[PDB]
Amino acid sequence: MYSIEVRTHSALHVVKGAVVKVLGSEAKWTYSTYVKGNKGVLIVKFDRKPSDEEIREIERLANEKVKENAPIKIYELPREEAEKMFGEDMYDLFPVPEDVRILKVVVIEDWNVNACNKEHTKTTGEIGPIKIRKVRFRKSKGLLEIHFELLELE
Amino acid sequence: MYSIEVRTHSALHVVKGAVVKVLGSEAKWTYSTYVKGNKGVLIVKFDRKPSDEEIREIERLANEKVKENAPIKIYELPREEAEKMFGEDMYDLFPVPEDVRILKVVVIEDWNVNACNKEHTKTTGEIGPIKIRKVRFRKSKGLLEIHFELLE
Ligand SMILES: [Zn+2]
Ligand SMILES: [Zn+2]
């Protein structure tokens, strides 16, 4: 088993992938994330407020990735190499300090790659049904908030 | 007198103000800053590559603020007080940690307000002629690089 929070954190990587698939590469940059219990907040850099249909799609695709039970692999390589093997996409808006010479990159094949040092579940199925509760688009900073919560079902 | 670097850092605040005056409020958020000797790099969040004429205006405007010899005031208030007194504009894209309950906000009336703890010149004139050398717009991240160097 996995703690609910380790579960919610993992959902973030899944939700991010769904976001990029639906909104495109322009929403590929993460600004920040927060997790509290079964609730999660993914803020990505974007330029508009997604339509209700797109939100639905992000949700659908995110839940489909959960059911596929895809593995969440975690490679540990040299900054330089990882830099060339995964490219710029493994990062967020905010750079991982340069004092760090070795990176732990989380990968969900064809979905999301991110230098992350936190604990993740071994597979996407271990996350469970995800529900997007609120979506806020902050015009000034041009950031998109995707609020979601995991579900106490089975 | 002031160190060349203290000068270049101060120019940052001046250049940022010129950038917002010319490009608008959408270029109001700073992503990062770098200063080495007489060289300075201001990266702001933006969506397009400014035209050559706009770059010229940013430069002009920036140098005119230098000649006005405006004072660079430095207020030190609680964070809750600066929050309401200067609003969100005093910040950058990345927030000053919440462990800091007292802020040092740099202000150049009607030009730029920024929570900054570094050393600044007492007035804009003490900066000197600014020259924008290169401007790079990185489409992926949507960031605009304003490269400039002081002349002294
Ligand atoms: Zn992670
Ligand atoms: Zn400063």
From Swiss-Prot, chain A:
Free-text remark on how the cofactor is bound: Binds 1 zinc ion per subunit; the homodimer seems not to bind zinc. The zinc is probably not catalytic. Another report suggests the zinc is catalytic.
Compartment(s) of residence: Cytoplasm
Gene Ontology CC annotation, any one: cytoplasm
UniProt cross-references to SUPFAM superfamilies, sorted A to Z: ThrRS/AlaRS common domain
Cofactor(s) the protein requires to work: Zn(2+)
Keyword Zinc attached: yes
Superkingdom in the source lineage: Archaea
Listed GO MF terms: aminoacyl-tRNA deacylase activity; aminoacyl-tRNA ligase activity; ATP binding; metal ion binding
Key words, A-Z: Cytoplasm, Metal-binding, Zinc
Gene Ontology biological process terms in this record: tRNA aminoacylation
Known function: Functions in trans to edit the amino acid moiety from mischarged charged Ser-tRNA(Ala). Has little activity against Gly-tRNA(Ala).
Family listed: Belongs to the class-II aminoacyl-tRNA synthetase family. Editing domain AlaX-S subfamily.
Quaternary structure and interacting proteins, as annotated: Monomer and homodimer; the dimer is less active in tRNA editing and does not have a zinc ion associated with it. Another report shows only a monomeric form.
Descriptive protein name: Alanyl-tRNA editing protein AlaX-S
Gene source species: Pyrococcus horikoshii (strain ATCC 700860 / DSM 12428 / JCM 9974 / NBRC 100139 / OT-3)
High-level lineage: Archaea, Methanobacteriati, Methanobacteriota, Thermococci, Thermococcales
Gene behind the chain: alaXS
